[PDB]
Design a protein around this ligand. Structure first.
Ligand code: KN0
Ligand code: KN0
Lengths: 241, 234
């Protein structure tokens, strides 16, 4: 079971579970309009969702949960997960966001609402921060898994002993991933003080990622397209192998 | 910088000393009550903020931005802390204690109500301490708005460095409190993580709250940049 993994075993499992990088729809009309870019981003996200499920199922401890809880975590976290992926990819492209290898955008290219440019600006900042911190791949997979387990946990609520067990199991897996992060940092040769400071610096960034997702989710719901937001039923369907 | 020299004990002492008082609701409609209470709390929050070590080292403009971004999170975490010992209830004030069902009469707040309850219950199961609480609140103040400063000028860059250094000092403080309490090294890193991860959820609740204010046509109750600037300048 997941709770028995060593730090080295957890890292290996997470790295192996990594999803592929997808391309955006090839050769779209350029310049973009507000709708056309959204069409590209939405299509891309839709295609990544499938791979995210595959990834999620390989996150140690995820499948120990009921299907309902597995769906609830994905519901709450999908955009955060996509965004941290985006920020990781964009690290060595200052001033730009690498949504896909064939879709590298600066803050002016894509046509966007001014609410969108704020989010874009926030994504860029986060990416620079990771660049500055010299974030490592092994740390990234830990953070992405933390987002998956953490984002929807406080809203299980609640009662039943089983509901409590589920929450308890999530927190224990979270603890193991924390252990893993620290193990990586110590292994790298950071002092105890630097280890504890870096951990905190990384986790605090997650709150910003939650903010960006909240803002993005907000915009998504204001689109009279009745969908790019995956439903509970859709996510559940996708979960059944 | 003065802040950068503080020990863990001094940091805690300063923070405990800066705590605002717990205010009473004057009239014990939900929007009417939150508004009356929040308006009076804001005044105390500004003065609490100016007492957080490192905060007044920032430009007046940067202080306003931090508060602008953090204000609802700070109100909300105060509420969660106050409600900690009241399972199933939110203690908006000593004379305003609400359960989930009175939280239904209040329209689209039921979900936010539930999230708040869930956070308070998390605090309860963690045995969150007053000393840890004041650290968390300070972290929210310095962290929520730091990524949207605008960089550019040398000053804004120097401002961000300073914020990050103070945050590191608060991390040190938290760890010290835990070691002092007898936690093993492992338990210290774990609890640190658990505490900080709750902040993602507080941000989430603040965002839903804002979302709800706008849909309620209550955009007006939000402290504006200029309002905050004038309160600080006092
Ligand atoms: O791998 C991926 C795939 C898609 C996204 C992505 N980010 N944003 C926010 C955003 C995107 C562009 C410009 C401004 C904000 C999105 C929005 C949106 F509606 F939230 F914007 C809608 C659909 C997808 C995205 C991503 O971050 C990573
Ligand atoms: O000590 C406290 C603790 C909580 C609140 C608070 N304000 N708001 C929005 C709000 C309403 C009116 C005026 C200002 C803010 C809240 C909402 C929300 F869903 F309504 F946002 C939901 C739950 C709590 C609050 C508070 O104001 C003070």
């Amino acid at each position: 079971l997941a709770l028995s993994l060593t730090a080295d075993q957890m890292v290996s499992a997470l790295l192996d579970a990594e999803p592929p990088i997808l391309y955006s729809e090839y050769d779209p009309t350029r310049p973009f309009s507000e709708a056309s870019m959204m069409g590209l981003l939405t299509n891309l996200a839709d295609r990544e969702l499938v791979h995210m499920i595959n990834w999620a199922k390989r996150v140690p401890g995820f499948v120990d949960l009921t299907r309902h809880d597995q769906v609830h975590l994905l519901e709450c976290a999908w955009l955060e997960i996509l965004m941290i992926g985006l920020v990781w990819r964009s690290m060595e492209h200052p001033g730009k966001l690498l949504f896909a290898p064939n879709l590298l955008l600066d803050r002016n290219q894509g046509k966007c609402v001014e609410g969108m440019v704020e989010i874009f600006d926030m994504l860029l900042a986060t990416s620079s921060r990771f660049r500055m911190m010299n974030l490592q791949g092994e740390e990234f997979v830990c953070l992405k898994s933390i987002i998956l387990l953490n984002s929807g946990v406080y809203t299980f609520l609640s009662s039943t002993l089983k509901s409590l067990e589920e929450k308890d199991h999530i927190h224990r897996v979270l603890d193991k991933i924390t252990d893993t992060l620290i193990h990586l940092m110590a292994k790298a040769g950071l002092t105890l003080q630097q280890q504890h400071q870096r951990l905190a610096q990384l986790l605090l960034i997650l709150s910003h990622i939650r903010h960006m997702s909240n803002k993005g989710m907000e915009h998504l719901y204001s689109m009279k397209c009745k969908n790019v937001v995956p439903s509970y039923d859709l996510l559940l369907e996708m979960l059944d192998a």
